[PDB]
Amino acid sequence: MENFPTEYFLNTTVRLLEYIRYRDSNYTREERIENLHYAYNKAAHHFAQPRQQQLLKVDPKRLQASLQTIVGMVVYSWAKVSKECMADLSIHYTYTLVLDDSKDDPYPTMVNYFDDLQAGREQAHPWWALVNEHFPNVLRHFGPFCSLNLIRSTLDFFEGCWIEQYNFGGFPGSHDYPQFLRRMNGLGHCVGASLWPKEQFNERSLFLEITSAIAQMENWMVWVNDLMSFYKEFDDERDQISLVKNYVVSDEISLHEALEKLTQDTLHSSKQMVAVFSDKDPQVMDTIECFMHGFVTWHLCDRRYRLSEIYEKVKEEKTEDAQKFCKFYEQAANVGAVSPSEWAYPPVAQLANV
């Protein structure tokens, strides 16, 4: 199909939003902007420090854009946490997105990973040096259990990026590969566990609800990111691997059948997320609900996903799905579409030369 499944894509997206009850929040634009600027400002000063500028090899423009996309993701989906927590998570998730830009083989820098770690010597891989040095700022907002989940998920992520340098979709017939990889690079347990600051949640008292949230949120969060990204990756000949593309290669099926699997898995996860938490601790279901809505709003408003294009193509159309979609899209824009000039300034590079 040299043609993007617009009708199909519209149907699945709409059903998703209905399933989760995509709606309005008491999260006002003024509030969004206060948080966006706050998280961005702290993170920008952090990455402009000389040490960060030195060990972190990233093109300034790509770093600028990666940060802006992460602050938006965190401020929008982690609506219930403090400003400091939004800012610290913003730094952490920016480090993870940036590692994706590296092509350097980790092998030589991991030869002594364990012994250095055990001995307390700075890690040879500069990414780990920066990330572990900064980790305490993130972990101070959480209890021991949630902290362990963040630490594990970030280690899994490092391995995920190592594996991806091989641009490997999986051996035909290796059915377990696709999801094995998506979970490795998903940060599912990092996200899931980072939603529960010890400041407003008691880890020990809500252990079972948190653990369940982590387990269920892992798959929802990544599957939704895959679905929403399916448009920008469709004609991207540079990106050769993804959950859907690997389904195609590893399971030996069509892109349509791979998209079908993703869409069914995504809806089943949404339906079950609601069915499980719609009657547990209120604050928990609130964080969970704000995350699902925020996450979707972020995908719809960030130009990285180019969803404005699909909107603009079915803007004036009589079909049911199209209208439902546009209304949703329009909703998101009302609270989500904010000019970067209102919060993302000054540029990281500017603060860097100072």
Added chain:
Amino acid sequence: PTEYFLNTTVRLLEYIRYRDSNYTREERIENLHYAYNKAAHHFAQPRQQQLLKVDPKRLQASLQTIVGMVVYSWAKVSKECMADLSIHYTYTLVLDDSKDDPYPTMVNYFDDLQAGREQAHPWWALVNEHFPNVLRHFGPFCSLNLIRSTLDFFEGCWIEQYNFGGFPGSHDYPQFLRRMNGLGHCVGASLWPKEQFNERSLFLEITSAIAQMENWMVWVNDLMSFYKEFDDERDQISLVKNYVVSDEISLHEALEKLTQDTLHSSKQMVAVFSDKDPQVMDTIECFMHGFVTWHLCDRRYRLSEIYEKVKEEKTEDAQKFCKFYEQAANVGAVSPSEWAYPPVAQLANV
């Protein structure tokens, strides 16, 4: 109770055509003793005896169960490798049985780690101190997988202490927890010692083996230990029991789902690795058949109590289980007195 258990075992053993031609009696014994002997001297050291709070009797039984597992499944690795792995997997089995809350000793996990201070939790203190003896056998990628899987496992035991089978409707919980405490990437990666495999040359094959072997291994173990669990189920929270609670299905449907996954997993393991590097295929097969032999023979899985209460048929079922249980017993049934000696306690006391 079920005798159906025989069905969803025969189907498996039959599909993989279970045949453990690994080792010769003399070889199995030689490795079992070497492995046991090094591990035994390690766990009998004063520092180990002190920080590792375990009843001697349990330690003794756990060590023998693991040495068997390792020697029987990691058939192509050196004697030293089997020994060091036996020590590591014995530490994991011990933590699995612990009841001491991790919470208070994990409060400063990261800061102590980053600073290079001994961890507060005694298990971590020992396992991390010993870890290099295991890692020296592998390249950086495999080592990372062992480290991650062991960390995941620690979290799995933490969660397990809540005897929670998941909220009804939480379809993702059962497998989430199983992978967490399954040591899948630890097993899958510990199969490729740098001594005989090149981590860079076979990156893709190894990565694929870890992904596929993670599920085959855990699923096969779940199936084989269904008896040992349903029976004296001291409020257990196994994969099968969690499928029932979370997916809201009969114990039968659950056990049926597991076997189907296991069959499919076995199918794909062959389809993918048959025509690939022969040395890789060899190690994979030796693990699969060896792993089965160990389940059929090791006391821990009480599959004997089932052999004797089923000797009464001659078809394709019931007589198939006994037929297999016999094949396994021939090569795998070895008297502990031939390798597991002297007792850890004896070495410890001296």
